[PDB]
Amino acid sequence: KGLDSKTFLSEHSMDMKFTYCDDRITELIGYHPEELLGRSAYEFYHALDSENMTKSHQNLCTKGQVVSGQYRMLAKHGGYVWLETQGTVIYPQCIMCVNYVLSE
Amino acid sequence: TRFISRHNIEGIFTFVDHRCVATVGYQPQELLGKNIVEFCHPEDQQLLRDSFQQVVKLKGQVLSVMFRFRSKNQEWLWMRTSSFTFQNPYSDEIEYIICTNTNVKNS
Ligand SMILES: O[C@H]1c2c(C(F)(F)F)ncc(OC3CC(F)(F)C3)c2C[C@H]1F
């Protein structure tokens, strides 16, 4: 899997809800963009990463840019994939995420 | 409303979200391959070229540009494009530009 192949974009409202997701998210994590709309990213985070991700978000919201560092994202058919995400606030109107899958 | 696109540093569309139909009237394949500057108003072409040139020097920070974009239905629409470079720090591939493109009021 090439680097471009492990990267997908997502867009979020200020409350973390998906408003847009690349179709690439499908072959990586199972979900279809269509079924992610309106659901908060927070629902998909491993419990052990929840607080870190809340803080990453808080740093994004005040500074405009953030690197999540590593976190586990719940796959559609069970299991957690590791990800890293660069987030950017577009002014606030939305959050743009460039998400890279650290797993296999 | 708005649509995301990705470009190479020369301005060429390399990815376009389907939200573009409702925003500017084209299908993704009518944009893919072409340089964004080909859809831009001749008075705004240079500002736009210079903006692509600068976004790659701003250390992955957000650069915003406002320009007129020729919709499929023929008309000049005012667009606000906020853009930023991304480069996967695991690799040394050339960065590319991620854009969000919104129809805004000039007023
Ligand atoms: O809080 C923002 C965020 C971040 C952050 F690091 F930038 F803060 N990282 C991952 C995020 O969502 C995941 C990307 C995904 F995989 F699509 C779900 C999100 C949703 C945004 F609202």
Side-chain angles (χ1 to χ4, degrees):
Chain A
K1 273 183 167 290
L3 279 217
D4 200 69
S5 292
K6 300 192 289 158
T7 306
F8 63 99
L9 301 163
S10 74
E11 186 202 75
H12 301 262
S13 49
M14 294 323 282
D15 51 12
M16 321 178 53
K17 288 172 182 232
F18 287 83
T19 60
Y20 166 79
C21 196
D22 273 350
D23 277 324
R24 186 90 79 194
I25 194 186
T26 302
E27 52 201 11
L28 309 163
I29 315 189
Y31 310 101
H32 279 280
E34 140 270 330
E35 79 201 328
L36 293 174
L37 306 207
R39 304 191 44 179
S40 155
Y42 210 85
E43 300 170 32
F44 305 84
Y45 299 157
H46 193 290
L48 294 178
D49 300 311
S50 295
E51 321 91 288
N52 316 252
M53 296 310 288
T54 291
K55 283 208 201 89
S56 264
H57 188 80
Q58 280 174 22
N59 288 16
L60 177 63
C61 273
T62 78
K63 305 302 275 278
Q65 272 261 26
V66 90
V67 191
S68 66
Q70 318 193 339
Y71 74 92
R72 280 157 285 185
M73 176 94 181
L74 154 72
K76 180 159 138 154
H77 310 293
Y80 284 90
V81 177
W82 293 88
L83 288 206
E84 266 182 353
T85 282
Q86 174 180 305
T88 306
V89 175
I90 304 296
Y91 298 99
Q93 317 318 295
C94 76
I95 301 184
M96 291 281 281
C97 297
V98 175
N99 310 295
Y100 175 74
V101 179
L102 292 161
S103 286
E104 37 179 57
Chain B
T1 50
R2 69 188 172 251
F3 76 93
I4 305 174
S5 53
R6 140 167 83 273
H7 308 252
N8 61 23
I9 63 165
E10 200 216 292
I12 304 286
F13 276 101
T14 51
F15 172 84
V16 190
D17 129 40
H18 159 98
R19 275 180 312 173
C20 73
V21 186
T23 304
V24 294
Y26 306 85
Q27 300 281 317
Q29 57 277 23
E30 306 169 81
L31 296 176
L32 247 236
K34 299 167 173 193
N35 192 310
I36 189 166
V37 176
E38 293 173 34
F39 297 86
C40 172
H41 194 286
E43 270 172 349
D44 301 326
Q45 289 174 10
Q46 196 50 61
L47 175 60
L48 190 58
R49 276 179 192 271
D50 304 307
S51 302
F52 278 79
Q53 274 149 231
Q54 221 190 31
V55 71
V56 313
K57 304 169 186 169
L58 289 203
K59 305 220 193 302
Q61 293 169 79
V62 174
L63 179 167
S64 186
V65 73
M66 203 170 137
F67 67 103
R68 298 154 274 191
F69 183 114
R70 184 195 75 245
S71 86
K72 198 213 150 47
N73 302 337
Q74 266 300 258
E75 274 138 6
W76 293 121
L77 305 180
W78 277 108
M79 294 306 291
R80 180 159 268 117
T81 287
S82 309
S83 74
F84 57 93
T85 50
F86 170 76
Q87 196 261 148
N88 184 331
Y90 288 101
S91 80
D92 197 31
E93 299 295 285
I94 189 60
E95 74 270 81
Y96 57 75
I97 301 144
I98 309 279
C99 290
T100 313
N101 304 284
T102 307
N103 199 187
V104 287
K105 292 193 170 190
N106 178 29
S107 90

